[PDB]
Design a protein around this ligand. Structure first.
Ligand SMILES: O=c1[nH]cc([N+](=O)[O-])c(=O)[nH]1
Ligand SMILES: O=c1[nH]cc([N+](=O)[O-])c(=O)[nH]1
Ligand SMILES: [Zn+2]
Ligand SMILES: [Zn+2]
Lengths: 374, 369
C-alpha cells in the first residue's frame, strides 16, 4: 500500500523573496550571529523580534528558515528517507492573506503555476493544494478558482481562518465555498492566526513556541469550523468537502459539548434555530469533513477515528515545521514517525485501516489512483 | 453502587444579594417581560446587556436565574429525580475574584461556612469544594485554607484560571498550591474568563451562548493547565492533585501535540528545559490530574479514560447551568443523562469501570464517609 502525506509545506523562492522584503509580520530577516535566516510568522514572535533588533545579545526571533522550505530536492529526499511515496504539498501560512487587493490575483496565479511545475518534476509522486487571493474582490477569487482547477496536479485549495477578512462564517464567502465545491476541490483548512497573545500570560516567552503552536493553532481551527457550522455553511453548501488540520484541532473532543450547548441554548431553541431535522455536527463529521492524522498520539487519533471514521482520516507530517533538534535534519524525522506510530498503535500494523489512513484514503478522495496505476 | 456528582454548583442567597447590588459584570437584573431575573456573568454577554438596557425590544441578556441556583431543596430534588446519591457542591464562577482585597477574606469565610451548614442539612449526601479569597494577600489566602480544611464536609478547593490575577504559572501562587496540597485538599480547576470575545467574530451574537460555553470554557482550562505544566508547578508541588473541569477541557486530545511541540522546541531544548528524565504530560495526567466526565460523548470520554485511566474519571452534571429548554425543569435533565449515557457507551453498563466513574472513584479519592 502507498503512503501519502497530505499535510506538507513549501515556500517557493519567489515567495521567500516577498517575505525578505516585508517590514511587518510575516517577514524573513537575517541576523549577523545566525547562519540561517529567521522566519517570523506569528503575532506571538513580535516581542522577541523587537528585542532582537534593539539588542544583539537577545535570542534569535521566530524560527530558522531552513533550506527545507524552498528546496524541492530536499522535499523528495525527506519523502524517500521517511517512507513516503506521494506528497500533496501546499503553500504554508500565511498564504496570500497579507497581499494588497490589486496585486493578489497576479501573484496567486504565478505561485500556483509554480507549484504545478514543481509537481511536474516528479510525475505521480507530487500533487498540490492551491492558495487563493482572498484579499481581492470575490470575482477575482472565483476566476482564480477556475484557473487552479485546470492546473495539472492540483487536487484542492488550502485556506486560513480569516476568509475575506471576517472569518469563515462571513456570508460573502459562501460563493467562494460554492465555486470550490462545484469544482470538486477539497478545501484544506489550516491555522495561522492563533489566539490573542494575552491568553498565554506574562511568562509566555519562557515556554518557546509551545503554547501558540500546541494550543493556539488547533483552537483557532476549532473556532473557525464551529463558526462555519453554526452559520449553516455545511447546509448551504451541501457538496462542500473539508480537510481539517491537526485532526480537526480539538473538534472530535468537543463535538458532544457543542451538541449539548446547542440543544440547551434557550435563545436558539426559542427562535427556531434548533429544528428536529437539524443535521448534527456528528453527521457533518461523517459526511463533509475529513481529518488529517497530525495528532501525535493514538489517543487523539482514536477520538478522530470515532468521529469521522477510519475512511476519513489522512496521514500527514507537517514537514518542514518540526525538524529534529539534535539529530540529522536529513535523516528520519521524529515528527513524522510519531504520527505513523499513532496509526499503528490505534488500528494495528498491516491492517486495512492502517493502509487507508496511511495513504489509501487520500488516493481515493483525491483521485491519485489513475496517476498511480499509470 | 453510589452515584456521585462532583461538578455541581450553587449561589448562596446572600451571594445573590451582592449580585443585584453590582453595577458591572457579574450582575443580576430583573427585566419587565420576565419576572425570573437575569444572571449575567460573562464578558460575552456584555453587548447584549447594553442592547437590553437601551432598547426594550432587544433580547433578554445572560441566562435565567432559576430557583435551582439558590435553593438547596431544588438541589436535592434534582438529585432524587436524576438518580444522584451524593453531590460535591461548589460556588459557581466567578467566585470571589471581583471582590476588593479588604472585604474578600471575611466574605469567603462567611460563604464557606454557609456551604458547610448546607451540607449538614443532608448528612452523607452533601460535601463541598471551598472557594478562596484570591484577590486578598497570599497570607490571608493561606489562613482561609487552614480554616476550610477544618470545616465539616469540605473536600477540596474550587478555583478559577486567573489565580492572583496573573494566571496559574504565577510564582507567587506557588505557596498557595503548597498549602492546598499539604492540607490534602483536591483542587477543582474551573473556567470562567474564556477567551477574548473578538475570536468569535462579528456574528457571535447570532449563536447564543454556544461558542463561549462550548469552546471558550474548555480552551481556557487547557491553556491554564498547560501554563502550570510548562512552569513546572506539578514538579514543584509533587503532592498536588487537581480535578479538571470538562474532562480537562481539550487536554486529553492535545497532550500528544503538546509533547511533540516541547521535544521539538529549539529554544527549550538548547536552554536545557527538556532533560531526559523530564516528567511528561502523560505522566502528570496519570499521577496528579483527575478528570470530570462532563464531556457529553463516549468519544471524548474514551480519550479522557485513555489519558488518565478509568480510576481517575469522575461523573458530573454541571447543574444548574443547563436546564431542559422545552421539557419539565422538575424532571430528569438531559444534560445529566447525556454524561451517564456516555459512560455506559464507553465502558458498558454494570461494569466495574462504570461504577468507578459514576461514583466510586469520587468516594475513594475524596473520602466520602
Ligand atoms: O508556522 C507554522 N507553525 C506550525 C505549523 N503547523 O504545525 O501546522 C505550520 O504549518 N506553520
Ligand atoms: O456560567 C457558567 N456557564 C457554564 C458552566 N459550566 O457549564 O461549567 C459554568 O460552570 N458556569
Ligand atoms: Zn501545517
Ligand atoms: Zn461548571
Amino acid at each position: 500500500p502507498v503512503v501519502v502525506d497530505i499535510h506538507t509545506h513549501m515556500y517557493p523562492p519567489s515567495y521567500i523573496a516577498m517575505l525578505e522584503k516585508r517590514q511587518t509580520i510575516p517577514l524573513v530577516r537575517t541576523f549577523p550571529q545566525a547562519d540561517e535566516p529567521r522566519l517570523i510568522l506569528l503575532s506571538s514572535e513580535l516581542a522577541a523580534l523587537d528585542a532582537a533588533l534593539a539588542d544583539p545579545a537577545a535570542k534569535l526571533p521566530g524560527r530558522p528558515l531552513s533550506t527545507h522550505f524552498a528546496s524541492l530536492a530536499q522535499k523528495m529526499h525527506f519523502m524517500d528517507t521517511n517512507g513516503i511515496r506521494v506528497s500533496v504539498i501546499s503553500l504554508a501560512n500565511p498564504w496570500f492573506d497579507f497581499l494588497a487587493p490589486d496585486e493578489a490575483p497576479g501573484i496567486a496565479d504565478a505561485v500556483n503555476a509554480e507549484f504545478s511545475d514543481m509537481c511536474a518534476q516528479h510525475v505521480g509522486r507530487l500533487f498540490f493544494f492551491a492558495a487563493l487571493p482572498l484579499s481581492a474582490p470575490v470575482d477575482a477569487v472565483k476566476a482564480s478558482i477556475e484557473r487552479v482547477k485546470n492546473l495539472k496536479y492540483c487536487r484542492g485549495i488550502i485556506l486560513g481562518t480569516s476568509g475575506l477578512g471576517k472569518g469563515l462564517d462571513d456570508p460573502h464567502l459562501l460563493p467562494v465555498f460554492e465555486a470550490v465545491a462545484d469544482a470538486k476541490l477539497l478545501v484544506f483548512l489550516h491555522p495561522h492566526y492563533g489566539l490573542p497573545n494575552e491568553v498565554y500570560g506574562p511568562r509566555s516567552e519562557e515556554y518557546g513556541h509551545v503554547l501558540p503552536l500546541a494550543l493556539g493553532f488547533p483552537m483557532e481551527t476549532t473556532i473557525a469550523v464551529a463558526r462555519m457550522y453554526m452559520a449553516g455553511v455545511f447546509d448551504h453548501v451541501r457538496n462542500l468537502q473539508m480537510l481539517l488540520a491537526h485532526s480537526g484541532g480539538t473538534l472530535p473532543f468537543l463535538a458532544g459539548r457543542i451538541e449539548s450547548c446547542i440543544v440547551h441554548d434557550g435563545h436558539l431553541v426559542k427562535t427556531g434555530k434548533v429544528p428536529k431535522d437539524r443535521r448534527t455536527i456528528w453527521t457533518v463529521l461523517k459526511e463533509q469533513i475529513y481529518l488529517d492524522a497530525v495528532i501525535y498520539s493514538e489517543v487523539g487519533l482514536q477520538a478522530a477515528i470515532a468521529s469521522s471514521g477510519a475512511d476519513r482520516l489522512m496521514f500527514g507530517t507537517d514537514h518542514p515545521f518540526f525538524p529534529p533538534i539534535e539529530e540529522d535534519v536529513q535523516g528520519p524525522w521524529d515528527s513524522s514517525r510519531l504520527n505513523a506510530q499513532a496509526v499503528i498503535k490505534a488500528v494495528g500494523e498491516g491492517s486495512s485501516d492502517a493502509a487507508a489512513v496511511m495513504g489509501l484514503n487520500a488516493v481515493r478522495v483525491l483521485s491519485l489512483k489513475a496517476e498511480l496505476e499509470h
